[PDB]
């Protein structure tokens, strides 16, 4: 289970020639979108910043501000996503999502639950540097209920480390979840927040299997039968992530492409934020769990230059 991405540092890189290339495309009458998507999808996020710095030092124009004006549509949303630095991306998505009573809970659920504690320690700091208040403070403001209490548990980024499997704790946690689920009629949601948010990944992977043999249900089936709403999605999101993170994002991409139409914001977020992390593992678990390739479903659910950059980001 080696994590590798689909986009690496382009060999033979020049900050200035690529800046001059992106200039002529946007300069003049109209655009040359194929010259932009080929450049951006074949350059790493670290290289994309050196081109942005050389673009401003050469012409005195903001490369990001010139892309929003020259482009539009779904192609505009994907291009600016690749431009945002990896250090700023996850905080940028949580920023624009956490806003208002119509807060998109899926973006909060997908990012906070599938990111390692070390990944979230950098997210909380970057959120406070670029923006005003704290990520945790802005979460509880536009959130409530047990769904809020689970979000801040994960935001603490203090999960137990992997350092051995405890048979005694595995059997008692599996019983405590059973003694808070099917047996305890109703639901004691606080017991699920403590176990699913604190214990180590290796410990919970063995609690999931020990819970199955003492109850008969998988840990995912008890969650849905007892919980509903955003709390049900948060519990299932951490469980699928603890089992395998690339397997969870592969599910988030699969269900974003079928329905009445394409969830373009979700497909852009996952394919970009993991393009240099574990996107190859995502498409590996994608051909395994759904009997089709990511390159195929993007081919038939997207159009124009917007699908060209998505397929180059996939890599055949």
Query: What residues line the site for Ca ion (CB under 5 A)?
Result: 185, 258
Which CB, 100 or 185, lies closer to Ca ion? 185
- What's the rounded Cα separation, in Å, for the pair 266 and 258? 12
Which CB, 1 or 185, lies closer to Ca ion? 185
Residue of 268, 279, 300 whose CA lies nearest to 82? 268
Which CB, 257 or 314, lies closer to Ca ion? 257
Distance of closest approach, residue 22 Cβ to Ca ion, in angstroms: 12
Question: Residues of 139-166 as b/e, b for ≥16 C-beta within 10 angstroms?
Answer: beebbeebbbbbbbbbbebebeeeeeeb
Distance of closest approach, residue 72 Cβ to Ca ion, in angstroms: 12
Which CB, 89 or 178, lies closer to Ca ion? 178
Nearest residue to Ca ion on Cβ basis: 185
- What's the rounded Cα separation, in Å, for the pair 287 and 250? 9
Distance of closest approach, residue 60 Cβ to Ca ion, in angstroms: 17
Q: Helix axis angle, 15-26 relative to 63-70, nearest 10°? A: 30
Output the six-digit token pair for 219: 């840990």
Which CB, 89 or 306, lies closer to Ca ion? 306
Distance of closest approach, residue 89 Cβ to Ca ion, in angstroms: 26
Output the six-digit token pair for 292: 């089709």
- Give the H/E segment covering residue 278: none
DSSP state of 258: S
Distance of closest approach, residue 236 Cβ to Ca ion, in angstroms: 17
């Amino acid at each position: 289970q080696v994590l590798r991405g689909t986009v690496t540092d382009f060999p033979g890189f020049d900050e200035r020639a690529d800046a001059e290339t992106l200039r002529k495309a946007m300069k003049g009458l109209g655009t040359d979108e194929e010259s932009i998507l080929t450049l951006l999808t074949s350059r790493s996020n670290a290289q994309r910043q050196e081109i942005s710095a050389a673009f401003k030092t050469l012409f005195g124009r903001d490369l990001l501000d010139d892309l929003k004006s020259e482009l539009t549509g779904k192609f505009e949303k994907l291009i600016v996503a690749l431009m945002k630095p990896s250090r700023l991306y996850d905080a940028y998505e949580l920023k624009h999502a956490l806003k208002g009573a119509g807060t998109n809970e899926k973006v909060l659920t997908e990012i906070i639950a599938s990111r390692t504690p070390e990944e979230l320690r950098a997210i909380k700091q970057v959120y406070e540097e670029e923006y005003g208040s704290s990520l945790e403070d802005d979460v509880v403001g536009d959130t409530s209920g047990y769904y809020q209490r689970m979000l801040v548990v994960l935001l603490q980024a203090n999960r137990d480390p992997d350092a051995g499997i405890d048979e005694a704790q595995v059997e008692q946690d599996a019983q405590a979840l059973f003694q808070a689920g099917e047996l305890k009629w109703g639901t004691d949601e606080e017991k699920f927040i403590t176990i699913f948010g604190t214990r180590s990944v290796s410990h919970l992977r063995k609690v999931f299997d020990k819970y199955m043999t003492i109850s008969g249900f998988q840990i995912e089936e008890t969650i849905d039968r007892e919980t509903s709403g955003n709390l049900e999605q948060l519990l299932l999101a951490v469980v699928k992530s603890i089992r395998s993170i690339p397997a969870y994002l592969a599910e988030t991409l699969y269900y974003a492409m079928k329905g009445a139409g394409t969830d373009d914001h979700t497909l852009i977020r996952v394919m970009v934020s993991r393009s240099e992390i574990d996107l190859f593992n995502i498409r590996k678990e994608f051909r395994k769990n759904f009997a089709t390739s990511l390159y195929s479903m993007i081919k038939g659910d997207t159009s124009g230059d917007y699908k060209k950059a998505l397929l180059l980001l996939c890599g055949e």
